[PDB]
Amino acid sequence: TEASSLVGKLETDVEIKASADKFHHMFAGKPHHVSKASPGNIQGCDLHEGDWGTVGSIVFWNYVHDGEAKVAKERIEAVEPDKNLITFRVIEGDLMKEYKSFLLTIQVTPKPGGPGSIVHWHLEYEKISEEVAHPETLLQFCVEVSKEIDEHLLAEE
Questions:
Q1: Which residues contact 12 (CB under 8 A, 6 or more apart)?
Q2: What is the CA radius of gyration of the chain?
Q3: Which domain of life is it from?
Q4: Closest listed residue to residue 119, CA positions, set 19, 9, 14
Q5: I need a labelling partner for 148 at 20 to 30 A (CA). Which of 13, 55, 59, 118 fits?
């Protein structure tokens, strides 16, 4: 049958130990990062608290994973402050070579109970063609972010 509509989607739910409240906390102007010992340290402007206006925000997340420098190129498409929702748009052209549009939305809310929060991954992507698209790659992207963000929040106060 193939992707008859060519739009494909995949939805997965990852469980985290990180509090949804503690995740939601990143949308506030204090995630803990200070330019200290800097009376005028020139190295560019340190990436601080979001002042990009939330929607339309383009930020880059850079991390080292297995010795490789991994960077995520993203654009905020939509954010629910009350529902704790964040929609990521792919901007990287590399991923655009398999999907002519890829949108992934995550929502972190309490689900098992209390601090137990589940991250709902909602992925929607338009196949350029079937053999061209590889659903595998999105899941790997999701899992590697899930574990990082969870542990990064656990690693912090």
A1: 121, 123, 139, 142
A2: 17
A3: Eukaryota
A4: 14
A5: 55
